[PDB]
Amino acid sequence: KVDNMKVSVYGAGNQNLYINKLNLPEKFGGEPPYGGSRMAIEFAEAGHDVVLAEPNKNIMSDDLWKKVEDAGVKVVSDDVEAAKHGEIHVLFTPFGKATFRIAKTIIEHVPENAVICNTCTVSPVVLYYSLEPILRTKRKDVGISSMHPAAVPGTPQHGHYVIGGKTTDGKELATEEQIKKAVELAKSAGKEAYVVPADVSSVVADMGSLVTAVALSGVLDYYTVGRKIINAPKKMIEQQVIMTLQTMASLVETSGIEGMVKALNPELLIRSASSMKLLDRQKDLDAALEILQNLDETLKAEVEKAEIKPTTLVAAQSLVKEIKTLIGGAAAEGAIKRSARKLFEH
Amino acid sequence: NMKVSVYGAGNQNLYINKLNLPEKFGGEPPYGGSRMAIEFAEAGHDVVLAEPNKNIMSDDLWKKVEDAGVKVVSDDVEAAKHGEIHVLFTPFGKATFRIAKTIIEHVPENAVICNTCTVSPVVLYYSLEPILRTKRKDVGISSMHPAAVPGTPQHGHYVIGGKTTDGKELATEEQIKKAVELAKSAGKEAYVVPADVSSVVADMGSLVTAVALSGVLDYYTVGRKIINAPKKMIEQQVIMTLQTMASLVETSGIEGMVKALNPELLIRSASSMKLLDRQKDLDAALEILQNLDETLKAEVEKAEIKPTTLVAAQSLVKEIKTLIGGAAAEGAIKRSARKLFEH
Incomplete structure (x- = not known):
């Protein structure tokens, strides 16, 4: 069951970046808005029930906001309101600033069995690690995945998404059902969608x-x-x-x-x-x-x-194995998680 | 001047007949290790070239080696006892490790062993560490990476592996100085680079x-x-x-x-x-x-x-050092590095 899902998108996208810095309309094509707000539009045009959370109204002109509203997207300024709405949560936080903060803000409010997907920059494995204390304890129902676009959404060049799935070393960050839901959502507006292990997905598809x-x-x-x-x-x-x-x-x-x-x-x-x-x-x-x-x-x-x-x-993967043999799998995994967070989160 | 031992004449069939260096890059044979020996000998050093395989070059090329004043031996142990500096030009498989292990308990007091191509000096050090730790605390490990095939015009410098970025001294200042001088006496420039990055900057x-x-x-x-x-x-x-x-x-x-x-x-x-x-x-x-x-x-x-x-590798290294202590973390780093790069 993947039709008319309740979807929450976080972040409209920096339209100054897309329109003036990247000059997408003239050099790539399409029309603004681009990015997260365009994702919300395309999901809504596919028949999903979509909320877009964006605290900064000034991030685009009234004329581009009209495009969002006309697709039937509901716009809210409160991330917690978007958190209670969706079965799937799409974080459009390209510069890896807000990603952790928004995830931490929504995790105790998302509905049962929700999946949270990052779009770009932050790896879903690192997002999982940042949330792991709550995911391991109070929200074991919540999945973490990703929906990496092949180009900025809204440009003609965007023809697929990459979805972060089971890792190469066998970790399931989301259930098969949650991954299938992300894949089918990603296919809105005629897009292709491919599952790639979550430990490699950001290296293939992000900037x-x-x-x-x-x-x-x-x-x-x-x-x-x-x-x-x-x-x-x-x-x-x-x-x-x-x-x-x-x-x-x-x-x-x-x-x-x-x-x-x-x-x-x-x-x-x-x-x-x-x-x-x-x-x-x-x-x-x-x-x-x-x-x-x-x-x-x-x-x-x-x-x-x-x-x-x-x-x-170092020989890194050999070192991982060696650490497991010295201090055991649980403590080695603790060491890997803590040190991955120190570089990629903190 | 210095007593130098070079190990490995170089695969002249590869350089001359397969790669055709004389026509594609320039220079004249021999190339590689035997050419290093020739250049060191012409610069006034007392050079032994250890090469167990007489057939690795034609007779005319052996005559060039000998006319330069290089002494050719078939036994690595004789070359081991000769040199204050040992330069491995060794078949780019595991022969580097075998020859190093063969000579390490025969080289003179305070000798330095340098690899040339492929193997990182840090890994060479790790392969010898049970002996360096204890019985041969005097022996240094370094490298003399030509960064081009010796004998070709493109060979103008050596990269020498010095103190590592994390502060390990795999050879003394005096040993590193010998490698630098051995490079400069042969008309090459010599650049000292931390040994943990030298193979990445200079090898293939x-x-x-x-x-x-x-x-x-x-x-x-x-x-x-x-x-x-x-x-x-x-x-x-x-x-x-x-x-x-x-x-x-x-x-x-x-x-x-x-x-x-x-x-x-x-x-x-x-x-x-x-x-x-x-x-x-x-x-x-x-x-x-x-x-x-x-x-x-x-x-x-x-x-x-x-x-x-x-993983975040360097963060993980810091993490393991704090977890099990510096000594045990270094052991884990050494063993795992040997498992990938030696074994």
Whole structure:
């Protein structure tokens, strides 16, 4: 049963961002409003009973608000009023500011068996962790998922959503029924919807997908050159890929992007990577060599001023296993949750 | 001048006949480890090259090695007793670890052992740590990463692994100084980089480092200048992406990682991020991912996605240090790092 659901959307979307910063109408298409308010509109046009919670009326003009009201969306300023309404709750909080606050505000008011979905930025696993004390105790009925759009809702390019489902390591953050409800809601207005494990969904579909796609292209370039030209052993290539990506992630975590750049040194990196220009067409490498030679002088200045903080070489998944064997599964999971919250929530 | 031992002449068939370095990059054979030996000997050092496989190069190339004043031996133990500095140019499998373990109890007092390519000096240290801890507290571990094949014109420097960013000294200042001088005496520049990052900047995986970095900087620019996303958000997203990718390859291999991330979905989302006039990194990526090899395309669907735990790695390291104490946390980090990168 997935027709005429009661839906709550939180956040109309920063129309100044969409209209003037991204200039979506002229460069991508569609008409405002965009984002969360457009999601509410499309859900309502699909026959769902939709409430949009938005505390700031001034976030868009009266003329765009009329578009929302005409779709039959009910607009409220109080998140708690939207919380009591919906069986599915969609957080449209792109800048990861309000996401935790709104979730914490609504969790003790949402109806029995409600599911709460984040749309972008914050990973549903991190959202689950932030809510876990109540989800484990008083609200075991509530599910956590996500509904990541492929492009800003309202633009022609938005043709699907990615829904965060059971994690690769077997964690169910929402019931099968709750996930099915999110999937079918996502399909409103003719959209495609795909379930991807919740521990990877944000890396595939959110704005960080830019980094994912470019890093992946480098990984595949090296895999090809490594195997087909150099005949470097596969396990060696994988070990180097792991160490590269892990080191880069760890340095950003301790030292920020500027500190990470300072540690890896573009000038050294250009010299080493030039030696790997070994086949016909490696446009990813060509592009990187040119970008790294032409860094912004403002970025460069902040890089000399940056401090490289202590950063420990790890094999991360191997370390997880090792921690489980030392202190047991429950305590290891506690350690993983606490440290994930310290980086991604606090 | 210094007593130097080099281990491994280099696969001349690979450099000359498979890769055709003389015509595609330049220079003349031999390349790799035997060329390092030649250059060190021509700079006035007392060099032994240990190479058990006489057939690894033609007779004429061996004559070049000998004419440079390199002493060639077939036994790694003889080379072990010779050198104050030991440079491993070792087949890029497990031979690095075997040769290191073979020489460590025979090298002189205060010797330093340097790897050249592939293996991180931190991992080499971990592989030898039960011996370094106790019987050979005097022996240092470092690296001399050429960052190009020695003998090619592109080889102009070495990257030397120094004190780690978290403050571990795997070799003394005096040992690191020898590696620097060994590089400078052969007309190369020498750059000391923390040992925990040196293989990432200098070895073949630097291809991946450069391309991944360019994407990180692309998003940093979009994020700050167009979206006005907060810096910490941008950083959190970068960390999540790079960590998830590393973790998926660790559990599931490159194909499993590709399967988990789904190139078609990824292409669609990343396309929406073409928000600047020139993002050649993104353009190149979209073309690469849209046009994957049909054989590669095939082994990805066949791949299994294994259990993979979302972590904040450095936060988790701090968390384990406080939980079980620094000594036990370091043991856990060492063992688990050896399990992936050595075993």
